Amino acid sequence: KASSDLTDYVIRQLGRTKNKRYEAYVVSRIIHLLNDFTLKFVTQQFVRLSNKKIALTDLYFPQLGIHIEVDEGHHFLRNSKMEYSLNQIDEPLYSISQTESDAMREEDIISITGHKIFRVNVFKNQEGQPQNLENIHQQIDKIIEEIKTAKNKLIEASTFKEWNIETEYNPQTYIDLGRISLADNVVLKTTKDVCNCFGYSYKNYQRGGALHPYKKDTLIWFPRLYENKDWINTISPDGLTITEKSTDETITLKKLEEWKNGPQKRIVFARVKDNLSSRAMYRFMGLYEFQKADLKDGAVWKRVKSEVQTYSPK
Amino acid sequence: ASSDLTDYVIRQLGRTKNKRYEAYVVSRIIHLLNDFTLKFVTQQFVRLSNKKIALTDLYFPQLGIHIEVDEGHHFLRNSKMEYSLNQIDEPLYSISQTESDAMREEDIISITGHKIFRVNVFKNQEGQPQNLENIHQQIDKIIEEIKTAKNKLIEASTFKEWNIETEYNPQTYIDLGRISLADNVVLKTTKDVCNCFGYSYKNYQRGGALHPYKKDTLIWFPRLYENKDWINTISPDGLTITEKSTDETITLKKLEEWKNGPQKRIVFARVKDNLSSRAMYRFMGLYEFQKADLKDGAVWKRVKSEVQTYSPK
Amino acid sequence: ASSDLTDYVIRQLGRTKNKRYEAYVVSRIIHLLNDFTLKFVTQQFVRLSNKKIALTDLYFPQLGIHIEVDEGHHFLRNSKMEYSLNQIDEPLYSISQTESDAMREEDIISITGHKIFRVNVFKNQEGQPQNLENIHQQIDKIIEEIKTAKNKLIEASTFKEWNIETEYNPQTYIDLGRISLADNVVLKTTKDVCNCFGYSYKNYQRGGALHPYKKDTLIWFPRLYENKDWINTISPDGLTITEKSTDETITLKKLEEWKNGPQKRIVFARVKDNLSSRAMYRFMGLYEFQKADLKDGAVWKRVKSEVQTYSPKE
Amino acid sequence: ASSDLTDYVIRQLGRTKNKRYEAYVVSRIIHLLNDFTLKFVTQQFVRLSNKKIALTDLYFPQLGIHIEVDEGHHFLRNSKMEYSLNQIDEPLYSISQTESDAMREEDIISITGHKIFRVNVFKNQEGQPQNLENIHQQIDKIIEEIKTAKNKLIEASTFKEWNIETEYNPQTYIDLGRISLADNVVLKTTKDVCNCFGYSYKNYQRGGALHPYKKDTLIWFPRLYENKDWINTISPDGLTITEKSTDETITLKKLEEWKNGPQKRIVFARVKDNLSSRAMYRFMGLYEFQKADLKDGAVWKRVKSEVQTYSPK
DNA sequence: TAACGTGGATGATAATTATCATCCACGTTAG
DNA sequence: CTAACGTGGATGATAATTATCATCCACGTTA
């Protein structure tokens, strides 16, 4: 039973509304020729550019940290919000206008720092004259080979953990591991789970933050990393720096002392929309420590640690 | 221009999916097969044993092989489709007669001699449930079958490789010497098929053409469905074609022309291309005049599946 | 069918509340007024002088009168609205420019010459509300203002009573003979406005339409916001309309086309109906061609606020 | 000051609408009546003859008058309601018992002596609504009915004006001298009702308190619904209250306590306020002990609808 | 040949559900 | 006795859940 979840995930991931003309063929061919479902993959993954604009990559393997983007330059897409711009080589060529990027703020957006991006060029030249299938299949094949070599590089280092739908959103799996890391790409369905990972007995949790039971200097935090009515929060494209401020200056002057004398460490889980079904979920961004407090720029938290230890229920 | 191959492939695999599991299975079959010397068509309209119009998810014309996925009644993207059981090799998915009447102009072929494979996404034959891995097996088996089929054709030297550029060119058809049903021949316009038989025509607007090299044969470009001027039908086996007109007076006046006229007709039916919705003409055969009545119309039987071509005179 | 009036009234007073005290004040004004010969609109989108998009709680088109409720800094979270100060004849409630670009297709009018009355719901801001009696006094004097306005219009014979059935029918405007801004004229589709000038059209899919009885004038159905093909804008006073296109080539080829004629254009703007949200077309005026140039594109200035109609041509 | 009046009025008219035309009718009635010396409640929970929980769109407690909007059952924002026919003095709209079990703690009153006016918004429903004018006519006749009722009450000097500040103050009821069912008396906490009878208390945590000036009387603060500790019910007429326990043993032991204990009880029932969801206590009257048994628990009958209060000792 | 109208599908958001934290009166165990 | 903590009802806050509605998108139609 429950082997249908893999099928549903795969179908829905390959069944998204197409942003590009040649995307579907390349993505599907890569997935099918790979034929390894122990490797989790995401289509149309939102990423954060150095330019602070929101971009997207057509294929994403979180475990291997590998992106695959098809390049059809300029003019062939029909009536979409996407735009064609040049950026760093490790960043995608397709972005979204800042106007439409502010509406998608709640969506899941990650950092591409350290990630490698491969491009598949479908056009011989301008005007969208297609290129013969042979070379495209060559590109796809060498990309796949690179992926496999990466996976091998991970499994020999024993850093590779197999993909399971059922256990990946389960807190107990992370209690058993028991470390929670960025390399594992950890995201949980709700706040109660994240709280229960650290030893809480909580049945449901509606509160914005909770003090770490086994560490007096640490605070479990569930921030919105974008701007909403209550707070103005930002995060650097590298994910190293997080700024927290408030829309009202009364709350701002009131929170300063609480931040300065309060717990100096915070474990950050950011609230994000799921790429499928649009449900609120929480992604682990790291372990941050308090750096400085200004009124203008707000509070500045720097990222000290990329891994956090979990605990059994108390 | 080898780009036409790729454009064709991506557009064929880029159709709006009627079924939920269609895309995955079809694409996996195509990619794992990895033979593009085999022409394939997706969402091919076929005519069942009855008069209803059905469709198959994948079609190989060269091998005469169809592949259909069975997801059951639900998971329907198009609500007007229907789920029914039929003759031994026939698709399980059909279209309502109301919406099939809008599909008259579409290209519709005969599945009689063709073999059909089913992919069972839920329970296969023998009653055993399946998900993921098992499905792949089915696919794999299908692939093997396909491969064997090709081999079975290629050892008998009946197999002819697919080349995009030359298949719509009349010159190659005057060069090889024969136009047959096995090659699955369709041309872009009337002037081309006319040029196959030796005409010099720059453009041809006419419904029919006298054969230059044969006085007893007539080249016909009928609509095999019902339109304003004529009511035409063709049997699911493709052996019998019936023609009559909306006005019975025109039928009565055309009776004598039918009996005293040329007794054989080379038939190219006007059909919509599966892509781009442009009028194209598919070769249905060489037909002989059988009979004519007032009540049920004129009646044509198919004597030959092959016709001889000629160089321009 | 007098039920359309009922449906309209119920749906107008049944909108989702932007503010806490909106419903009470608006409904009390409407009920105590008890005059249905006066058309009224709730949550009417208006265009501020500073180019921000604003909205008014109650709107009488015939009298050109707006009524706004003030509870500051609160505005029923979570609302996209914001509280800022502006012109005396302009509302205190606005929308963030981020949400203003998504609302482009909405019906937005000019408040120039319009009078706005304010209802202050609080005695001590913030927190504690005020007493009913005083608020009712404000509402009463506002209602009296409405009545004396109506009287000053009817004694000048400029007032035309409100009828649901006849207002969307072209024949009534053919009988009246003139389409004016003071009448607040909006039609349900293009075929109707086309038929007002003498066309027999059953359906019209084209943006522009040639005036049958005048060769120098053009019936125009532009989108006054930015869409896929071209970019058009309109000044808050409605005096100036700028027309450009997304591609500069077509602008350059349309430049001479703009220069030779037709030098006059009667404008019906495409707007979303405040109820049921199906495309409708509002008459913005009679504009004349001023300038041809790149960037801001062609510039049209409004020469006339009224246009004469004609019987069907045959 | 009078801002509490404003807050109350706004919150009463700001409830999430159960019906489509509710808001318009209610608001027009309130505004056109324009008398705020009359307390009014919207979406008031009532107990039907048949023990189902119903609701009325507008309720005037002082006049004991209900106003219900009659819509076709087809338009409901809350699909949780149900459309049924009942007694003439009873509303047409009810709630399903499944969620009515969650509504136990809510404030529920008796409609027996109350009169209900209906506003019919649809001429031949389904489909088109009736014209505005007629609806306004119904609203008007209802309003003048209300005014005439108020006049009938002020002429008999049974009417007491509505004041927010003094209605929750025990001292005011000590000054009036009587706590009556007609006055619709509800207090914020047990300490207040205890202070009405002469107790001096900062807070009172106990379920019941002995009447200082009467040894045969007991001030009771029961839950009139079924809870963990006790199972209690009250008749729709409010005349009969049954008291039982989840455990039968405790009931058997409570038999002797009931027969040998104080034979009279002044009942203040614990209810959730219609606004702000705070525990409140409504005066149910003076009940006397009739009988006690294992199966039926104990049975209390209501002897008096009014009780005399006293100054602190 | 292209633009508009219509119904199922998708995402947004109001209305509801359920749990925790804070406050406060009362009671315990520690000197 | 006071000082430091536990216990349970009353009260308020808000995410998670469901429930309901509006917007998006593909297809058939028509100028």
Side-chain angles (χ1 to χ4, degrees):
Chain A
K1 57 167 294 184
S3 299
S4 59
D5 290 27
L6 182 63
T7 328
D8 183 86
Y9 180 85
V10 170
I11 295 304
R12 291 190 65 178
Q13 287 291 337
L14 304 182
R16 295 185 182 270
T17 57
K18 55 177 189 302
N19 288 328
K20 301 164 189 175
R21 195 168 181 264
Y22 288 75
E23 173 186 11
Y25 181 87
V26 177
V27 173
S28 60
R29 179 169 175 87
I30 291 178
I31 293 300
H32 291 120
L33 277 184
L34 220 179
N35 203 25
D36 198 334
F37 286 92
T38 63
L39 291 173
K40 184 179 180 180
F41 64 95
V42 181
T43 61
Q44 298 186 5
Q45 176 60 58
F46 291 160
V47 301
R48 182 84 71 184
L49 289 171
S50 181
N51 194 37
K52 193 183 172 182
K53 289 180 179 177
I54 305 178
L56 58 90
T57 60
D58 289 290
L59 190 54
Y60 173 48
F61 299 93
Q63 299 174 337
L64 306 183
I66 294 183
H67 296 252
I68 303 169
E69 182 189 56
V70 297
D71 189 347
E72 42 186 52
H74 284 305
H75 66 348
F76 273 148
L77 157 53
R78 300 208 259 267
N79 210 22
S80 295
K81 311 96 175 297
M82 300 183 60
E83 294 176 359
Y84 196 66
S85 178
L86 197 277
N87 298 277
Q88 290 86 320
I89 170 75
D90 277 326
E91 299 178 351
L93 307 176
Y94 294 91
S95 57
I96 312 177
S97 53
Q98 185 69 20
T99 165
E100 313 295 336
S101 296
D102 287 19
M104 293 177 182
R105 288 178 295 104
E106 299 182 359
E107 296 290 337
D108 181 34
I109 310 170
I110 65 179
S111 176
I112 36 80
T113 56
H115 298 174
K116 295 161 295 183
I117 296 188
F118 292 90
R119 286 177 178 83
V120 179
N121 301 270
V122 298
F123 292 157
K124 288 188 192 180
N125 287 321
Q126 187 268 355
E127 185 53 36
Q129 170 150 326
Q131 197 164 12
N132 50 80
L133 273 182
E134 184 69 21
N135 78 110
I136 294 177
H137 290 189
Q138 294 289 350
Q139 303 184 45
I140 293 174
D141 287 336
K142 63 174 176 57
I143 286 183
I144 291 172
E145 183 184 23
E146 202 75 18
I147 296 178
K148 289 188 176 182
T149 53
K151 180 193 176 187
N152 296 331
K153 186 181 299 180
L154 266 68
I155 65 108
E156 66 180 5
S158 301
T159 321
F160 180 81
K161 196 55 177 295
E162 291 191 7
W163 181 36
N164 185 265
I165 291 288
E166 311 300 325
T167 61
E168 68 172 353
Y169 295 119
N170 197 324
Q172 186 66 28
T173 306
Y174 293 107
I175 302 181
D176 291 16
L177 192 52
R179 47 173 173 84
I180 286 184
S181 176
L182 285 174
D184 290 25
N185 190 85
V186 182
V187 49
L188 299 185
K189 296 180 179 178
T190 164
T191 56
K192 64 168 183 179
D193 292 338
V194 179
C195 288
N196 291 344
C197 289
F198 294 98
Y200 271 126
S201 295
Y202 292 164
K203 297 186 177 181
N204 287 95
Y205 200 63
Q206 299 79 18
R207 201 165 184 260
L211 292 100
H212 190 5
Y214 293 161
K215 291 194 177 187
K216 293 168 283 294
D217 50 23
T218 318
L219 178 73
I220 312 176
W221 195 23
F222 311 105
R224 294 177 176 266
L225 283 188
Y226 43 88
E227 176 182 354
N228 65 321
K229 188 183 187 306
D230 296 325
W231 303 92
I232 303 179
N233 304 330
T234 70
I235 175 180
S236 61
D238 50 34
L240 291 177
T241 305
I242 295 184
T243 75
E244 177 188 11
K245 201 187 57 181
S246 180
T247 54
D248 189 28
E249 287 300 320
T250 62
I251 311 299
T252 301
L253 59 85
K254 191 58 180 59
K255 59 194 184 19
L256 200 69
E257 56 276 56
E258 284 193 16
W259 280 341
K260 281 193 175 182
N261 60 29
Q264 297 300 316
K265 297 180 181 179
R266 283 191 181 180
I267 303 176
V268 179
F269 281 73
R271 176 169 180 171
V272 289
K273 276 179 177 165
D274 187 20
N275 60 76
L276 291 176
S277 75
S278 71
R279 53 169 289 99
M281 297 193 63
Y282 299 84
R283 176 182 228 93
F284 166 76
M285 293 291 183
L287 172 59
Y288 291 70
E289 79 171 5
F290 177 82
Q291 176 164 115
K292 71 173 54 56
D294 297 358
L295 239 57
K296 311 178 193 209
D297 288 72
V300 174
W301 304 76
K302 219 70 172 61
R303 182 168 70 100
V304 48
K305 212 61 63 64
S306 301
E307 300 185 33
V308 291
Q309 178 182 343
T310 60
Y311 303 98
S312 299
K314 198 172 188 174
Chain B
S2 179
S3 301
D4 291 330
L5 197 162
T6 91
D7 185 85
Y8 177 84
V9 169
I10 63 105
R11 288 189 68 178
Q12 286 291 338
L13 304 181
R15 298 183 183 271
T16 57
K17 297 310 171 186
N18 291 324
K19 302 166 188 175
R20 195 167 181 264
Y21 289 77
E22 173 186 356
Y24 184 85
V25 178
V26 171
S27 57
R28 180 169 176 87
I29 291 179
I30 294 299
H31 290 146
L32 268 63
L33 179 56
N34 204 26
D35 198 334
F36 286 90
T37 63
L38 293 171
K39 184 178 180 180
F40 64 90
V41 181
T42 60
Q43 297 186 5
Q44 174 63 56
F45 292 94
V46 301
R47 178 166 291 105
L48 295 166
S49 183
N50 57 67
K51 275 87 174 185
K52 289 177 299 181
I53 305 177
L55 57 90
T56 61
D57 298 317
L58 190 54
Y59 173 50
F60 302 92
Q62 301 174 335
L63 307 182
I65 294 183
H66 299 248
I67 303 171
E68 183 189 34
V69 297
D70 189 348
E71 49 188 45
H73 161 249
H74 41 41
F75 293 141
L76 22 73
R77 191 76 190 177
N78 211 346
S79 294
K80 49 190 177 186
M81 302 183 63
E82 294 177 0
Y83 195 66
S84 178
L85 189 51
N86 294 279
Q87 288 202 184
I88 172 67
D89 287 321
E90 284 184 1
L92 304 178
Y93 289 81
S94 306
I95 311 296
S96 56
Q97 281 286 353
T98 301
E99 313 296 334
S100 75
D101 184 86
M103 297 298 180
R104 290 195 237 107
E105 299 180 334
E106 296 291 337
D107 184 32
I108 309 172
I109 65 180
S110 176
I111 34 80
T112 56
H114 298 172
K115 176 59 180 181
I116 285 212
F117 294 98
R118 265 157 335 131
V119 154
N120 307 93
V121 194
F122 295 153
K123 281 197 200 177
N124 192 217
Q125 279 278 299
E126 271 66 326
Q128 308 148 335
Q130 287 179 356
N131 255 335
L132 220 291
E133 315 92 24
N134 276 321
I135 295 182
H136 290 191
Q137 293 178 349
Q138 296 189 48
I139 293 177
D140 292 334
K141 296 188 306 177
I142 289 190
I143 295 175
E144 254 299 327
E145 279 285 347
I146 298 179
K147 290 188 176 181
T148 55
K150 185 188 173 186
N151 295 333
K152 186 181 180 181
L153 279 202
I154 209 174
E155 283 198 1
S157 302
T158 64
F159 178 80
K160 195 174 185 299
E161 65 176 359
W162 180 35
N163 189 263
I164 288 80
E165 304 82 352
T166 179
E167 71 173 354
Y168 291 151
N169 197 325
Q171 186 67 26
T172 200
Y173 290 108
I174 82 176
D175 281 20
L176 40 63
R178 57 173 169 181
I179 285 83
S180 59
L181 287 173
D183 289 25
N184 190 85
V185 43
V186 50
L187 301 185
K188 293 182 179 178
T189 164
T190 55
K191 62 165 295 300
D192 291 337
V193 41
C194 285
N195 290 344
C196 293
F197 291 99
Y199 272 111
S200 298
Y201 282 156
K202 298 299 178 181
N203 289 275
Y204 199 63
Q205 202 175 85
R206 200 169 313 185
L210 295 99
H211 189 173
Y213 289 79
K214 292 189 180 65
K215 198 172 184 178
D216 196 26
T217 68
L218 179 69
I219 310 177
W220 196 20
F221 307 133
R223 296 177 177 266
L224 284 189
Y225 43 89
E226 176 182 354
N227 67 319
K228 42 170 293 185
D229 297 324
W230 304 88
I231 304 180
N232 305 329
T233 71
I234 177 178
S235 61
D237 50 35
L239 293 177
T240 304
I241 298 183
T242 79
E243 131 148 289
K244 94 169 89 171
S245 180
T246 311
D247 298 30
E248 294 191 358
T249 62
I250 306 298
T251 302
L252 273 166
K253 79 171 57 182
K254 278 291 299 180
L255 202 153
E256 306 311 300
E257 278 70 346
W258 283 335
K259 60 179 299 181
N260 297 334
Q263 295 301 116
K264 26 187 184 178
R265 289 187 179 180
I266 304 179
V267 178
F268 280 74
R270 174 168 180 171
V271 289
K272 274 180 177 160
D273 190 21
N274 61 75
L275 292 174
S276 310
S277 171
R278 309 194 191 186
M280 294 194 65
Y281 301 87
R282 172 180 289 271
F283 166 77
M284 294 279 87
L286 173 59
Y287 289 72
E288 187 189 310
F289 179 82
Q290 179 165 116
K291 95 177 170 39
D293 288 327
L294 163 76
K295 237 116 236 292
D296 292 337
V299 140
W300 302 81
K301 196 69 174 61
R302 181 177 69 186
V303 49
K304 194 167 296 299
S305 301
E306 303 183 31
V307 290
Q308 178 182 342
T309 181
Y310 303 97
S311 300
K313 197 54 187 176
Chain C
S2 179
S3 60
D4 291 28
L5 184 62
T6 298
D7 182 84
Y8 180 83
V9 170
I10 296 302
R11 292 186 65 177
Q12 285 290 337
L13 301 184
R15 296 185 186 268
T16 164
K17 292 168 53 59
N18 293 324
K19 305 164 188 174
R20 199 167 105 101
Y21 286 76
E22 171 188 356
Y24 184 86
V25 178
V26 172
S27 60
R28 179 168 174 87
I29 292 181
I30 295 300
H31 290 148
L32 268 64
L33 179 54
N34 202 26
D35 198 334
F36 281 136
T37 62
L38 280 62
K39 182 181 180 180
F40 65 95
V41 181
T42 58
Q43 297 186 4
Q44 173 63 56
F45 291 94
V46 302
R47 181 171 301 280
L48 276 222
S49 177
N50 78 73
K51 131 270 177 180
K52 278 165 89 100
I53 263 104
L55 57 90
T56 59
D57 300 319
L58 192 54
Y59 173 49
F60 301 92
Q62 300 174 338
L63 304 85
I65 295 182
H66 297 252
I67 300 171
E68 181 189 31
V69 169
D70 190 348
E71 12 138 337
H73 301 100
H74 302 104
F75 40 85
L76 231 178
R77 63 157 188 98
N78 47 2
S79 61
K80 314 172 187 176
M81 310 180 55
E82 56 186 15
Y83 194 66
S84 178
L85 194 45
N86 297 276
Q87 290 302 98
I88 176 171
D89 274 328
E90 300 178 351
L92 308 327
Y93 287 86
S94 57
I95 314 296
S96 55
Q97 280 89 347
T98 58
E99 311 295 336
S100 294
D101 53 71
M103 292 188 181
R104 290 188 307 256
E105 301 181 358
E106 301 287 342
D107 181 35
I108 310 173
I109 66 178
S110 176
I111 36 80
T112 303
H114 297 174
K115 177 61 179 301
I116 296 193
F117 292 100
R118 290 175 178 84
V119 179
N120 305 96
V121 299
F122 294 156
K123 45 176 187 178
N124 295 116
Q125 174 112 330
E126 300 175 353
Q128 290 293 328
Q130 205 167 5
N131 52 79
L132 281 175
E133 184 178 359
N134 170 264
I135 296 177
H136 291 189
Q137 291 172 357
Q138 301 186 43
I139 291 177
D140 287 336
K141 64 174 176 56
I142 287 183
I143 292 171
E144 256 297 329
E145 281 283 349
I146 300 178
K147 287 187 177 182
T148 186
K150 179 196 178 183
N151 296 330
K152 95 173 54 197
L153 263 69
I154 66 107
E155 67 182 4
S157 302
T158 64
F159 176 82
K160 284 166 287 297
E161 62 178 0
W162 179 34
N163 185 265
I164 289 288
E165 193 169 1
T166 59
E167 67 174 354
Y168 289 154
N169 199 323
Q171 185 65 28
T172 60
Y173 289 107
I174 301 182
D175 290 18
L176 191 56
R178 56 174 169 182
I179 292 183
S180 176
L181 288 173
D183 291 23
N184 190 86
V185 182
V186 180
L187 301 184
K188 55 181 180 179
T189 164
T190 55
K191 63 169 183 179
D192 290 338
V193 42
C194 285
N195 292 346
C196 291
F197 293 97
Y199 269 112
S200 298
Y201 282 158
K202 181 179 178 182
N203 284 318
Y204 199 65
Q205 304 160 5
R206 200 165 186 175
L210 293 99
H211 187 172
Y213 289 79
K214 293 292 184 178
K215 66 175 183 179
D216 55 325
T217 65
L218 181 70
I219 319 284
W220 199 19
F221 309 134
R223 292 184 175 187
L224 272 51
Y225 45 89
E226 53 174 359
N227 67 319
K228 44 169 187 174
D229 45 287
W230 50 28
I231 300 181
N232 307 328
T233 70
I234 175 181
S235 61
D237 49 33
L239 294 177
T240 114
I241 297 182
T242 76
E243 177 185 9
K244 198 204 187 166
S245 173
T246 53
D247 299 29
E248 290 191 0
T249 62
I250 120 169
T251 66
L252 264 57
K253 79 174 294 183
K254 197 74 174 183
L255 200 151
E256 52 183 3
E257 181 71 22
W258 287 333
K259 278 192 170 181
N260 67 268
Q263 297 300 118
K264 297 180 180 299
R265 285 190 183 178
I266 151 252
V267 178
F268 276 76
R270 176 169 180 171
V271 289
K272 157 184 164 180
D273 187 20
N274 60 75
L275 293 176
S276 243
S277 173
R278 57 181 300 268
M280 298 188 64
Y281 300 88
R282 169 182 290 272
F283 167 78
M284 293 291 183
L286 174 59
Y287 291 72
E288 191 189 80
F289 179 81
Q290 293 277 110
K291 181 181 304 175
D293 191 6
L294 68 117
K295 199 189 167 178
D296 292 27
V299 177
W300 304 81
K301 192 182 165 303
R302 182 174 65 190
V303 280
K304 290 183 62 63
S305 302
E306 302 187 30
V307 290
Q308 54 186 3
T309 64
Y310 301 98
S311 300
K313 197 170 188 176
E314 182 62 41
Chain D
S2 301
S3 62
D4 293 85
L5 183 63
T6 298
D7 184 85
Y8 177 84
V9 169
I10 297 304
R11 292 187 67 177
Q12 285 290 339
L13 304 180
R15 298 182 183 270
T16 57
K17 283 75 192 173
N18 292 323
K19 305 166 186 174
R20 196 167 180 264
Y21 290 75
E22 172 187 355
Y24 182 85
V25 177
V26 172
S27 59
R28 178 167 176 88
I29 290 180
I30 294 299
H31 291 146
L32 269 63
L33 179 56
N34 204 26
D35 198 334
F36 285 90
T37 64
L38 290 173
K39 184 179 179 181
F40 66 97
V41 181
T42 60
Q43 298 187 5
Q44 174 64 56
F45 293 94
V46 301
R47 178 168 290 107
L48 290 188
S49 300
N50 70 60
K51 303 194 155 59
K52 292 258 185 176
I53 305 179
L55 56 91
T56 60
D57 299 320
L58 190 55
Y59 173 51
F60 300 92
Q62 297 175 337
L63 306 182
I65 294 183
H66 296 254
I67 301 171
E68 184 188 33
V69 172
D70 195 343
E71 295 182 2
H73 65 285
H74 192 278
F75 291 142
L76 290 175
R77 274 116 163 271
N78 288 19
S79 62
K80 310 303 178 180
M81 305 178 62
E82 62 181 14
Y83 197 61
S84 179
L85 191 51
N86 297 276
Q87 295 298 104
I88 44 108
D89 276 327
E90 301 187 340
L92 307 176
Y93 287 92
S94 308
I95 313 177
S96 57
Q97 282 197 355
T98 300
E99 45 209 328
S100 300
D101 187 32
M103 295 300 180
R104 292 186 307 255
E105 305 181 21
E106 297 292 337
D107 181 35
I108 307 173
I109 65 177
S110 175
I111 36 185
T112 56
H114 299 172
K115 176 64 177 60
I116 297 190
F117 293 90
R118 286 178 178 83
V119 179
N120 305 269
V121 298
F122 290 120
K123 52 174 182 176
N124 293 322
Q125 87 101 14
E126 307 83 19
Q128 261 93 327
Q130 202 165 9
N131 51 80
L132 281 172
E133 308 161 2
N134 170 264
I135 296 177
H136 290 190
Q137 294 169 0
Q138 303 185 42
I139 292 175
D140 288 335
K141 66 174 175 56
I142 287 187
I143 291 171
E144 59 199 9
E145 278 282 349
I146 296 177
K147 291 186 175 182
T148 54
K150 182 192 175 186
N151 296 331
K152 289 181 182 181
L153 266 67
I154 65 106
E155 188 181 1
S157 301
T158 321
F159 179 80
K160 289 82 182 177
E161 288 193 8
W162 180 31
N163 186 265
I164 293 291
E165 310 300 326
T166 59
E167 69 173 354
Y168 291 120
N169 198 325
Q171 184 62 30
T172 60
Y173 290 108
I174 302 181
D175 290 15
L176 192 56
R178 51 173 169 86
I179 292 184
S180 179
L181 206 69
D183 288 25
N184 190 86
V185 182
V186 180
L187 302 185
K188 292 182 180 179
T189 164
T190 57
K191 69 167 181 62
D192 292 337
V193 29
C194 287
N195 291 346
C196 291
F197 294 97
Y199 273 111
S200 302
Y201 280 151
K202 180 182 179 181
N203 74 286
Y204 199 63
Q205 198 175 341
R206 285 210 170 192
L210 248 161
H211 189 4
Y213 290 163
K214 291 191 179 65
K215 293 298 300 177
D216 194 28
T217 317
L218 177 71
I219 314 173
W220 197 21
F221 308 133
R223 293 179 174 93
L224 283 188
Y225 45 90
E226 176 182 355
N227 68 90
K228 40 173 294 185
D229 297 324
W230 303 90
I231 303 179
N232 304 330
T233 70
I234 176 179
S235 61
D237 322 84
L239 294 176
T240 305
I241 298 182
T242 240
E243 176 187 9
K244 203 189 309 189
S245 178
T246 54
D247 297 29
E248 188 175 356
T249 61
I250 309 181
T251 302
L252 176 58
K253 297 153 189 52
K254 276 291 181 178
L255 249 62
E256 303 83 2
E257 291 191 13
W258 284 331
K259 61 180 183 181
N260 299 334
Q263 298 299 316
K264 297 180 180 179
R265 286 190 181 178
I266 302 178
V267 180
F268 281 78
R270 171 170 180 172
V271 289
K272 275 180 176 163
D273 188 21
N274 61 76
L275 292 176
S276 75
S277 72
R278 294 202 269 273
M280 300 285 289
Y281 300 91
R282 174 179 290 271
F283 167 74
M284 297 276 86
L286 173 58
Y287 292 72
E288 194 190 3
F289 179 85
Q290 172 165 285
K291 75 208 267 173
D293 102 58
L294 218 56
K295 149 190 262 334
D296 290 302
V299 177
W300 304 79
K301 280 269 179 177
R302 181 179 73 185
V303 50
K304 290 180 63 63
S305 62
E306 56 169 326
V307 292
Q308 179 180 342
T309 181
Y310 302 99
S311 299
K313 70 174 186 303

